[PDB]
Symmetry: C2
Amino acid sequence: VLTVKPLRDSVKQALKNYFAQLVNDLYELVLAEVEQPLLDMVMQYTRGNQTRAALMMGINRGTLRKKLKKYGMN
Amino acid sequence: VNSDVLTVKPLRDSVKQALKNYFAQDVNDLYELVLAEVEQPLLDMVMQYTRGNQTRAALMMGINRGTLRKKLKKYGMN
């Protein structure tokens, strides 16, 4: 359901390009590059309504706010 | 944005489009959906990079062996 085709193929290519450029933070690095836009799009979709955003993502409001804070989006 | 080292042309742009296209199609599991979609290829590429060496993959990922093993199992990659 996530295509651009499958989104995962874009992740693979990005990692392939990255490795050709070379680390101990690859997981957080990728997470930041994917969670930030997810948060951006879901909040955009709900017009900034955190409860609706949290419910759509399947996480509680507290976790949503923690992530928004982590990425400096608060 | 945290980094600009992941390009396909930032990777984040591809995530937004997939989400844009997704919304254009109620949902209650978007986080897990996106998490699985990115964790699988990440684990795949990291393991290919370290030629199967789990300890090297975990160190590169910045997680411990147990966590990497748990993720690998979650997607039946072990």
